[PDB]
């Protein structure tokens, strides 16, 4: 690791600077270095890690979608052959995306998840595991596509089971997990009815628990609840 010689605290500080500078590849490298120091991550640090890689892979996903769309048009009946270049470059971006996903999954497996005992850390990491298998599933086409999908499902399901036992229904981690698992059902698993059921039940159970919350916790929970509603509006 090229960050092995830098202090953990300096890596975290520089991750925060990189975020302010919108340098998310640097942010991700700094937070990978911090994870590789071997200590557990605090709540703030977990969110720095997730923000960094979400921005990196989010850009890769957007590029992949543009290129895949161009590639499909080039393969429609009537298109003028423009050679291997579109496929090659889509493949290049796809391989870089898979590499980022594999890196994140590797950090979770070595050894963030196995040391995560509290619900807020363990659910957070298992949600990430589901998310990054989901991104692999978005581009998968081979002998292991079903196994990638099932790896996403299994991670989301373990996270869900813990969240329902250990977190209130308004906990924003629980809400964001359900939001993303619902999108997994809709977009990956071809299970729109499960997606809709999960989003609606999550929203309604959260609504009923809002009365227990402070103003600041209310704002956090209702933010994610609005995303659940937005998706339900898109889907119904």
């Amino acid at each position: 690791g090229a960050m092995g010689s830098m202090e953990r605290a300096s890596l975290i500080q520089k991750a925060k600077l990189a975020e302010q500078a919108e340098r998310y590849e640097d942010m991700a490298a700094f937070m990978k270095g911090a994870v590789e120091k071997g200590e557990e991550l605090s709540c703030e640090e977990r969110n720095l890690l997730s923000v960094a890689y979400k921005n990196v892979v989010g850009g890769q996903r957007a590029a992949w979608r543009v290129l895949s769309s161009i590639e499909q048009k080039s393969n429609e009946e009537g298109s003028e052959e423009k050679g291997p270049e579109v496929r090659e470059y889509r493949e290049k971006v796809e391989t870089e995306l898979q590499g980022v996903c594999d890196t994140v999954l590797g950090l979770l497996d070595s050894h963030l998840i196995k040391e995560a005992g509290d619900a807020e850390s363990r659910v957070f990491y298992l949600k990430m595991k589901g998310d990054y298998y989901r991104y692999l599933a978005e581009v998968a086409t081979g002998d292991d596509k079903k196994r990638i999908i099932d790896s996403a499902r299994s991670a989301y399901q373990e996270a869900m089971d813990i969240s329902k036992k250990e977190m209130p229904p308004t906990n924003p981690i629980r809400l964001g997990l359900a939001l993303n698992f619902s999108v997994f059902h809709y977009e990956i698993a071809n299970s729109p009815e499960e997606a809709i059921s999960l989003a609606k039940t999550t929203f309604d159970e959260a609504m009923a628990d809002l009365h227990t919350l402070s103003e600041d916790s209310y704002k956090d929970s209702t933010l994610i609840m609005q995303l659940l509603r937005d998706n339900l509006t898109l889907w119904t």
């Binding site: 998310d131 939001l179 993303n180 999108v183 937005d230 898109l234």
Partner: peptide
């Protein structure tokens, strides 16, 4: 796209 966080 649908929303994820």
């Amino acid at each position: 796209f649908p929303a994820t966080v």
